[PDB]
Design a protein around this ligand. Structure first.
Ligand SMILES: [Mg+2]
Ligand SMILES: [Mg+2]
Ligand SMILES: [Mg+2]
Ligand SMILES: [Mg+2]
Lengths: 107, 299, 120
RNA sequence: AAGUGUACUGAGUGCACUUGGAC
RNA sequence: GAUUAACCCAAGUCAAUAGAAGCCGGCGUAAAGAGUGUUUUAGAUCACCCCCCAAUAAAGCUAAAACUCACCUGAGUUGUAAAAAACUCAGUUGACACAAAAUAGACUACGAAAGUGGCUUUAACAUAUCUGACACAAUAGCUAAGACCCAAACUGGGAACCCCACUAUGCUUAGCCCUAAACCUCAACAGUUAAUCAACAAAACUGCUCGCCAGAACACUACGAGCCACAGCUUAAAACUCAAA
């Protein structure tokens, strides 16, 4: 644009950054509701464990449970951080292994 | 109750011998949802149309029905329906007269339900015919106020269940609504570019227009022929040109329809008033009812 | 009662503008008060009502319609409108509707409660 | 043939427009 | 998933979040030149050297061809792939429009744009010697009244597409609606041809100003608002999703 146009329009108005799945916080607490499996998008196919958890803000979200083996059950307390899974569309949270009811990865 | 597995689209292509013009709902879950919305079918007499592959048939049989009268047109699906009947010892049949089909309550519903997922090219004539049947208290409704659950295109269902002033108000809306309680309960889901709505019709105990079906149809069609003009523009055509002005004025005045009202701003009460006045006019003028303005203009 | 025995006699000899306070929600007694004539409902003080959700004006019009149905032909009520005399909201549209149609001919009787805003 | 706008009907048609097609 | 080996950092490591990275770039085809024209405050230096064709409105008029009506004849006419359906009507001659405007036109003009191609007359086609929001805006559509040859959404009949008849509508008046692939898809003005340049398109650029765009879809959408006078147009988002488009 012209110099006058730039002056009139002022500096760019950078849009506010959208709040991530964790609403801007690096972690949250939640209560597990229902565990289940999910099929990753092809070519990846290995079943992946997910759990519906009600965050500290009331919102319910599906969170991927990493690793092998767990004991998560209904009404159990977990801590969930951000980070989308590579091949689980929609799932945009991860249970932090080693906190609260999430007994360490049951190796 | 164990039933045969639903045919996949592979078996359907093999069955129709195409080796590669119809859409099949092969989703038993959606069929179960439709059967649920149809109501409680426990020990009910269900008349099923447009059977097709048979997902609706399987869902209804899963529902504890007493007799389920299937009517199919294509003979390539009869083998599957026969297998279904053998699995669930379903009366299959290949214009059909349902009145003689079943063994009749006075005008609650007489435990007789109708379920249909037909081609949209065939549902509209069928629903018009059944509306006339309700008007005459005959056909499938000899048993009483039989309830119907039919799948239409999304637009057609919206027009059927449209309210006064709703952009989808139209002839179908008025015709269905002055005889039936119509409820649009929509599917996006079919194995083979439109959405599908499910609509439930319950005949009204007291119809909102006590006039002949053909008379009401003529009145509504002439009213709605000009959907963007004042109602009188479309009403005036019911009369010969010679007496058009005076007859239209007399009609509107003997009714209480404001001439500025557009066609979609007319309620069933307005249509009742118009139909009554038009019936009086036809009674006192025999030639009026058969008049066709385009036929006159042909000269 | 005073209105029944003094003014209803004159009214029952035309159009009636029945003003109803939107905040406060006489309706069932209209058939005796005015008689069988054309009536238009005007919900006043709409501006003072907060906008709880979109389409609240439509919801209010609907609610007035069921209230009238509970009490009347839809005496016949031919129009339900929402106005705010203080802010002049909808007054011009009401005037246009009044002048646009044959049905609104004759005199106009403005009936309502004390606080309805009839003066305004 | 394709598409824009617009209106009726249930994807077509009517009017005008463009080649982001062929001769 | 386990095992071996290796790499980086190391009393740390690195998973999440947040921040630091932020406008002199573009607008024919990717988002982008807003349908068109004119102001003010201003801005810029480009200010100093400097007929007529087809615009528009009104009034009047008509050559060819239609329809209808007259006779005169004929019994079929129309319709197409071929038939149906339909009319008893058809041919010549004559009279005869409120419709449309061959040929010129292989011209490229007028108008801001949309548009403007029958004839005559009247009125008439702004301006500085720069750019820059109220007035217009094709076809379609609506209101009231007229015209209705022909064409024709829709309807009906015949065997969606084909044939037949006919209506909105196309036309006049008086008002509305304001959208088009409103496109030369290339903004106005001034200037240049000096060294070519994503590709294609209408060779490439410079200066100057205004408008417009900041991934896709959600979304010519919702909410609100304006115009409406209620079924629509203009303005126009958000959330959720994706690493594409
Ligand atoms: Mg200027
Ligand atoms: Mg402008
Ligand atoms: Mg226009
Ligand atoms: Mg016409």
């Amino acid at each position: 644009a012209t110099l006058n146009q730039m002056h009139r329009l002022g500096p760019p108005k950078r849009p506010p950054r959208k709040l991530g799945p964790t609403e801007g916080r690096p972690q949250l607490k939640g209560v597990v509701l229902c565990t289940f499996t999910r099929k990753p998008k092809k070519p990846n196919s290995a079943n992946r464990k997910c759990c519906r958890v009600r965050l500290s803000t009331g919102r319910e979200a599906v969170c991927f449970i990493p690793g092998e083996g767990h004991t998560l059950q209904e009404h159990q307390i977990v801590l969930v951080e951000g980070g989308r899974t590579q091949d689980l569309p929609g799932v945009k949270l991860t249970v932090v292994r080693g906190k609260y009811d999430c007994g360490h990865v049951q190796k | 109750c164990r039933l045969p597995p639903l045919p996949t689209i592979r078996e359907i292509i093999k069955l129709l011998r195409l080796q590669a013009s119809q859409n099949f709902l092969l989703d038993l879950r959606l069929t179960d949802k439709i059967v649920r919305k149809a109501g409680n079918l426990t020990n009910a007499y269900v008349y099923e149309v447009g059977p097709g592959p048979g997902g609706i048939t399987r869902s209804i049989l899963n529902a504890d029905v007493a007799e389920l009268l299937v009517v199919e047109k294509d003979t390539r699906f009869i083998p599957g329906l026969q297998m279904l009947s053998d699995a669930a010892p379903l009366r299959i049949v290949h214009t059909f007269k349902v009145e003689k089909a079943f063994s009749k309550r006075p005008w609650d519903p007489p435990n007789v339900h109708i379920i249909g997922n037909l081609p949209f090219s065939v549902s509209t004539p069928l629903i018009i015919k059944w509306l006339e049947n309700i008007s005459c208290r005959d056909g499938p409704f000899v048993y009483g106020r039989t309830q119907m659950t039919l799948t239409f295109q999304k637009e057609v269902a919206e027009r059927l269940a449209a309210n006064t002033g709703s952009k989808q108000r139209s002839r179908l809306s008025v015709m269905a609504q002055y005889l039936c309680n119509v409820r649009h309960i929509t599917i996006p889901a079919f194995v083979p570019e439109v959405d599908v709505g499910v609509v439930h019709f319950t005949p009204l105990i007291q119809p909102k227009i006590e006039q002949p079906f053909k008379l009401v149809e003529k009145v509504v069609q002439n009213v709605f022929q000009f959907r963007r003009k004042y109602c009188h523009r479309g009403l005036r055509m019911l009369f010969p040109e010679a007496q058009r002005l005076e007859s239209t004025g007399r009609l509107l005045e003997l009714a209480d329809i404001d001439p500025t009202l557009r066609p979609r701003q007319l309620s069933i009460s307005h249509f009742k008033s118009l139909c009554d006045v038009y019936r009086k006019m036809c009674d006192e003028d025999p030639q009026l009812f058969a008049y066709n303005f385009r036929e006159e203009l042909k000269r | 009662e005073q209105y029944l025995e003094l003014v209803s006699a004159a009214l029952r000899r035309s159009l009636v503008l029945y003003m109803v306070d939107l905040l406060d929600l006489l309706l069932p007694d209209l058939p005796a008060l005015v008689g069988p004539k054309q009536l238009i409902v005007l919900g006043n003080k709409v501006d003072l009502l907060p906008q709880d959700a979109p389409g609240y004006r439509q919801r209010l019009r609907e609610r007035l319609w069921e209230d009238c149905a509970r009490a009347l032909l839809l005496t016949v009520v031919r129009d339900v409108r929402l106005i705010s005399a203080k802010t002049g909201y909808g007054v011009e549209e009401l005037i246009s509707a009044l002048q646009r149609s044959w049905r609104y001919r004759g005199d106009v009787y403005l009936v309502g409660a004390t606080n309805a805003g009839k003066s305004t």
